[PDB]
């Protein structure tokens, strides 16, 4: 209902899933879409195509706010960093800022123990 025009798109692409959220420039979320909600389970949930589909779905879900241009902030190391931004621009939003906001502790806590598969 509210018109925002200038939005911010947070992509959160981990090794297993990609969450795309469109907010205003205040952090108020306007919509979201996930690779797991776009009909992908397990082996396929974490692929660039899945991230592309999720980004497209989020773009279409946030249509009535009349968003024209987007900042873009990318977080995580997952595959969904690339196809997600491609799908946003293909949807049509004017991508004006692309930022990596991946948390990098300046030490920080102790990571989980290493797997032995």
């Amino acid at each position: 209902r509210k018109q925002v025009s200038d939005g911010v798109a947070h992509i959160h692409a981990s090794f297993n899933n990609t969450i795309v959220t469109i907010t205003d420039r205040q952090g108020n979320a306007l919509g979201w879409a996930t690779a797991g909600g776009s009909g992908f389970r397990g082996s396929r949930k974490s692929t660039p195509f899945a991230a592309q589909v999720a980004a497209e779905r989020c773009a279409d879900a946030v249509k009535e706010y009349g968003i024209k241009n987007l900042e873009v902030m990318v977080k995580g190391p997952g595959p969904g960093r690339e196809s997600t931004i491609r799908a946003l621009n293909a949807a049509g939003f004017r991508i004006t800022n692309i930022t990596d906001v991946t948390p990098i502790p300046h030490x920080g806590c102790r990571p989980p123990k290493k797997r032995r598969v």
Partner: protein, 70 residues
Amino acid sequence: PVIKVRENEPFDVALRRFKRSCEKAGVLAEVRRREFYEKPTTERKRAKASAVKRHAKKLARENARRTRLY
């Protein structure tokens, strides 16, 4: 790794420049390094091993420069 799409900068080249900025910052290397905790003994051992292999490769390189194969 913050970029600003400039005037008359198309999307594909903006994304390419963002890619190269992320690699220049090396963020994904640090995240894949921090995904698990590796003991200080493992850190020291693998640092020493990487240095040893680099030295061996360069010595073999500028030694085989003085070698004919065919």
